Amino acid sequence: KKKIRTSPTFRRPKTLRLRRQPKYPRKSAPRRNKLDHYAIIKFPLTTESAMKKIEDNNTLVFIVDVKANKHQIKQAVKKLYDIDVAKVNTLIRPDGEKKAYVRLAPDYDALDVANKIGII
């Protein structure tokens, strides 16, 4: 005495959808991250403009992987150089590479960071 249809439209009833519980993983092991930090940072740029950025803007210039974004570049530099970075600017060169201008934190000196890297 309670089942009533107050709408003239029949909608498809809501039936529960189970979550997948596979009996075997389709891949035996997860594929490792090919874009680690060593792959992200390829080599630093040592041109006159790069040296000017190092000694004036407190900025290190790197050539990075084209698929790396600003967050990944920041984390890679932070990990494998043990320095804190202020910001990252990114362009893609006419030759297809990606170039990153990484401005360091004020308490870090791009000049002696470049010295210990070995690009003086």
Binding site: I4, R5, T6, S7, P8, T9, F10
Partner: peptide, 15 residues
Amino acid sequence: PKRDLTRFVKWPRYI
């Protein structure tokens, strides 16, 4: 008021 409309429902094709 929201009254019974079972006689006037657009039913599915199989029904």
